[PDB]
């Protein structure tokens, strides 16, 4: 109930992973850039499994980080696709949660004949004010137990913000 | 390795069940062939089992041969320790004499001054039972968190 | 064939010879800058041996 202890959304990583197709990955990274306003970096893998074109450095996945209220807007739209219904398991040990969309068109972005349907992974990070104690270059210290966001507290916050029961 | 089984008979028993342990304490510093170690366990197991039930006796080979197989034995190291309920108290010594003839050197049947598999002495173990402090499988002690 | 028995008795026959007084105080391996400055200090007032 402390004003310096209010759960807020750290970010939204959007992860789209394909196999070895030549342009399937490029158009998808582009498909995220429009919603995000941040150019999604291409995050490759270092394991070559036969998979479907999977290799070391084969542009396996695209991931983009969106922070602030501009990402809250995206999170709510993705939750409308899930019918504002998330399972209990979606909350993590550290209180982080996630949900997933099947089609870029689901968010309402127009289907383009050029842009095929792309599935995405929505991962939402939950951080209270004063969590940069773990990240500051100078005087870095571990976040304390009370400040760390527990899963039970996290579940209550989601109903308060995105109205998903 | 000739022997892969060292604890024999009643491995799944409980502490306090059998009071008198008997150990063939070695008196020579030498090496005992793994083959003799196997030979003395089977011969000792056969005698106790003929005499009394397998449940009564827990026979354990004390030293596992590692040297390459042959075991480096030292003065005052037990050879075959067996704890038994008083139903089987008398038989173990004559089984342990067969063990003495399979193993070279001077070895002596030594009766334990405690329950054998628990170091607490028979008097101390009796005191432990009266108090109820002993934890069945070590010392409950006064350390660790209180809650 | 290899053996070092009698080596220590042979070494101690009249050995344990110390290095020498010139060795302890020598200008060998010393810092060249130290050596140059030392010569200039010596070359003045009483220590100067210059004619």
């Amino acid at each position: 109930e402390n004003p310096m202890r209010r759960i807020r959304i750290e970010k939204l990583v959007l992860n789209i992973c394909i196999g070895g197709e030549g342009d399937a990955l490029t158009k998808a990274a582009k498909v995220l850039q429009q919603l995000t306003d941040q150019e999604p970096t291409f995050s490759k893998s270092r394991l070559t499994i036969r998979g479907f074109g999977i290799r070391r450095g084969q542009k396996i996945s695209t991931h983009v980080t969106v922070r602030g209220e501009k990402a809250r807007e995206i999170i709510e739209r993705g939750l409308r696709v899930k019918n504002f219904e998330l399972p209990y398991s979606c909350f993590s040990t550290t209180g982080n949660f996630g949900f997933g969309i099947t089609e870029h068109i689901d968010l309402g972005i127009k289907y383009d004949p050029s842009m095929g349907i792309y599935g995405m992974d929505f991962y939402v990070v939950l951080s209270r004010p004063g969590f940069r104690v773990n990240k500051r270059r100078a005087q870095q210290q571990h976040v304390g137990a009370s400040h760390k966001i527990t899963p039970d507290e996290a579940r209550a916050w989601v109903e308060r913000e995105f109205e998903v029961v | 390795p000739k022997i892969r089984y060292f604890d024999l008979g009643n491995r799944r028993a409980k502490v306090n069940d059998f009071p008198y342990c008997f150990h063939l304490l070695s008196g020579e510093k030498e090496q005992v062939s793994s083959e003799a170690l196997e030979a003395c366990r089977i011969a000792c197991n056969k005698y106790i089992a003929k005499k009394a039930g397998k449940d009564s006796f827990h026979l354990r080979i004390r030293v596992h041969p590692f040297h390459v197989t042959v075991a480096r034995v030292s003065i005052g190291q037990p050879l075959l320790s067996v704890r038994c309920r008083a139903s089987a108290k008398d038989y173990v010594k004559d089984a342990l004499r067969r063990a003495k003839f399979k193993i070279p050197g001077r070895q002596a049947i030594v009766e334990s001054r405690n329950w054998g598999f628990t170091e607490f002495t028979k008097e101390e173990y009796e005191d432990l039972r009266e108090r109820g402090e002993l934890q069945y499988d070590h010392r409950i002690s006064r350390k660790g968190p209180l809650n | 064939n290899h053996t070092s028995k009698n080596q220590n008795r042979k070494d101690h026959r009249n050995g344990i010879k110390k290095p020498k007084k010139s060795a302890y105080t020598s200008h060998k391996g010393m810092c060249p800058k130290y050596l140059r400055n030392l010569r200039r200090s010596r070359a003045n007032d009483p220590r100067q041996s210059l004619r």
């Binding site: 500051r136 270059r137 100078a138 005087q139 870095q140 210290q141 | 209180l146 809650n147 | 810092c31 800058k33 130290y34």
Partner: protein
Amino acid sequence: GWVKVQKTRSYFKRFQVQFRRRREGKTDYQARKALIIQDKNKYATPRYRFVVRRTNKDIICQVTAAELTKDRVVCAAYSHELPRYGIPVGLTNYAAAYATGLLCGRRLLEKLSVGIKENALAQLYPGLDKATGEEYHPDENENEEVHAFKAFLDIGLARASTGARVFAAMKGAVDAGLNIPHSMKRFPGYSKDGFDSSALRDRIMGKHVGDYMAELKAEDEETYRKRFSKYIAAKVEPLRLEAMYTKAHAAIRANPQAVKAKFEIKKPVRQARLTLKERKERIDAKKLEAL
């Protein structure tokens, strides 16, 4: 559900704690190893340094020589001492870091030339009379008999970037006469081989804040009431910024000697440690309730 614990007792014994200041994240010992190192032929000749630290409140500038059991500060200037010289707000500013730097250099030079007279540190090294955007090296040109003091900048864990407020102090000490090795690349104004004295002059006069104040005045007055609230209490305006800074630089040169200010000591009612009898009761309390 059932797994090994990474923080094992064996791990606890084997772990070697890092240095007290490394555990605090405060200092890099690799950086301080090359900053303080001297050839052993120089012996105990002092090797001074110019540690500059930036706290959210005020920039701390310290001239320190390291010693066998301690670090000795010959002279220090904190930005809380800038308001005495006429710098009311924005103590953590580029122009204010230059002003902390000028105070540090002048205070040390005056304290080195306490009464030397001939070949005095103050007279032999005046330094730039007024703050400009040019480059002046105290060691270069004027020299001999008495050299300018030498220190090495200790930016600590700051990143070495162009327009850094930790580099601004270096220019202020240089412009007081303390010699710090510099390259003017990490200073505002450097590209190709052309360095803009005007860009260094702009931030050293505070024009960059001056512009922000005007931008808010036209874009949103209400933000100016909130973002620049402290400035409004002191009535400093964008046009004044540059002239105000220069008078404050002049006062720092004119009277750099230190004043003690106001400090206090409060010993708190800290929860205290307990005796052996006291803990016997605490252990007993858990034991009696357990039954």
